[PDB]
Symmetry: D2
């Protein structure tokens, strides 16, 4: 207590939407963040505040957000470490529209189960070993790219060039190799209701005190 489930996989592999489904099925959606027993935590809350020079390149499409270094791993490891110790933590909120954290900060009170979703959430030895259960959402790259593209019409040519030069390699070099640390691999994502139901059942067991 608390039971950490880590969920990795590529960008647009289905991590977020799977975790949401698990919160939805557990009914934890119908509850305010202070009252929850199961809570999702996203690694992408822990992006580093970019410098002038970094934000510069970020505008000109020339900055890599899929590299380990892109993430404030210390803040991350320290947060987790406190969550694990049963403490209330304040987590930041990143804005991709400005490439920086919001003034305000999310409180997360102790949970029984923590779903920790992120592209590089199994990259570091120290963090890997904190998880009781390790899930990897396996979704082919071309499928993921199509999801990501359609999801980012909120300009093509920047998005696509940024993918091929920075994202594709970073994925292959840092993210894909950590799949070997997965305990269970979940093909597809939110269409794998049998897989989700299996995980929900397991979370139900923990909560009910049957495990």
């Amino acid at each position: 207590r608390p039971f950490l489930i880590g969920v990795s996989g590529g960008t647009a592999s289905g991590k977020s939407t799977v975790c949401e489904k698990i919160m939805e099925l557990l009914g934890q959606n119908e509850v305010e963040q202070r009252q929850r027993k199961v809570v999702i935590l996203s690694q992408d809350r822990f992006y580093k505040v970019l410098t002038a020079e970094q934000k510069a390149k970020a505008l000109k499409g020339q900055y890599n957000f899929d590299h380990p270094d892109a993430f404030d791993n210390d803040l991350m490891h320290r947060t987790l470490k406190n969550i694990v110790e049963g403490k209330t933590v304040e987590v930041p909120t990143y804005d991709f529209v400005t490439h920086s954290r919001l003034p305000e900060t999310t409180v997360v009170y102790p949970a029984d189960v923590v779903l920790f979703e992120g592209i590089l959430v199994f990259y570091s030895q120290e963090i890997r070993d904190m998880f009781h259960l390790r899930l990897f959402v396996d979704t082919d790259s071309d499928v993921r790219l199509s999801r990501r593209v359609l999801r980012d019409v909120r300009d093509l040519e920047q998005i696509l060039t940024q993918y091929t030069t920075f994202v594709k390699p970073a994925f292959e070099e840092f993210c894909l190799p950590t799949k070997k640390y997965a305990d269970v691999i979940i093909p597809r994502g939110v269409d794998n209701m049998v897989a989700i139901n299996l995980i929900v059942q397991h979370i139900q067991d923990i909560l009910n005190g049957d495990i």
Copy 2:
């Protein structure tokens, strides 16, 4: 009731040894086959009795046991179909040392959970849909070949030539594509105790009547 879990994956991927582990952890080993609630059933019990001409080629290394046609799919589908209906079934025993069934025949009484392990156990639509949960033991081919080789010193040159000409293609053509039907993928095999424990817990839940 009864809950069918199908487990596929390559030869020497770890299906048998994983299923054994699950029986061991559930304690179902310490019980006689008539008394069991969880029971393993192997597709490789359902190999066709070879003809003269077929057994001929089998000796001369020239017969393919990894092709769908190699299996008595009717007997198989009919057995399952009766198991599902809650009936006691008689299953055959194949002898690779003679390439034929033994005179005697194994009785399998109703179980609550049935673990059904086989290389092509998700090949046919009619059989796939019978399973409540579908597991695929993902173990790389070179690892599997090493297991199979070491496991078959009971002559190299026949085994290896038989692999490259008949087994490698049959695996790739018929077996590997059915991975897409897996609900949960289990990397490694019997070294994935977190995965096994998750499945055992789930089987425990069914048995206890918590699901």
Copy 3:
């Protein structure tokens, strides 16, 4: 004489742009189609004229152009067969904007070398064996999808949904397996100038009569 080089690979893998480069380097661009010794021939000239009902689905994004059946294989095989016999052929021109052939028709006079580029140009045994040399442009799917997308802004949501439901499977089922027939595999495409130069040199040798 004439020397057939077949070039396959995925959509947007680089087949067309590689073949163009080879024509450019051989200088065959600076020559009218009647005067050429090296000529490119695209399988996508041989799409079937769609019916009313087929064109219907084509509009509603619901028709598969990456299936073997999508191509007029008879016309194709017959054309090739005549090219091989040293004859002048008339080839059709397809319009994706109307999903039908143009009234007019391209004449192709005997060449010494024929570059035959297509997604399924190694699918059929009868056609495979006509090629003296078989090239496969290997470019990862996510890279290809990005090329195809950017190349088809001439609407996202139709293009992307059409890819995932029809193109991704057809590629994997029919196209990717024919890579095993490739003699030489060319990673990347038009950025592989060493590979192209090797092929150009070889074409130069044939032409010069050094082979």
Copy 4:
């Protein structure tokens, strides 16, 4: 002059047997090493002389010969560097039966073409860029393992355990990623006569002074 062709690929992928075929077809076999114009050079001549403690582990199956560090890269780079400068070099001979170099040493006189075959022959930037043409023999791991096994009956259990714990990872980590540097990929190996003939023709062109 001299034209370096580098050939990489896994152990038992077919590098050696392909290079031999190219020497055989060029007729360079029928010539003494001092008289040759085309010469093969194997990276596995450049293994480090093991220490007491290293040879110890080598006996007890516990030493990794597929790691970059396993090779005397300085000697290697220096040899190549001199070959490239048109000089006669002395190359060592390694004995796996004793894990050390032989007293005597092979002289290699200037060649016009040098075929340089090795598992990690594209690993280092400095060495990669020396090659005019870069070939990668792509042969699936299970096929390679079967070749290697049958080839090393000159004890199973040591060979197989040594593969899974040391060779499989080293291959995946160091060797397989360098495939991206290949100019041309040759599937299969010595059964790809069309590929070999293409390379032989090219070597013939260089020699004849047609390139």
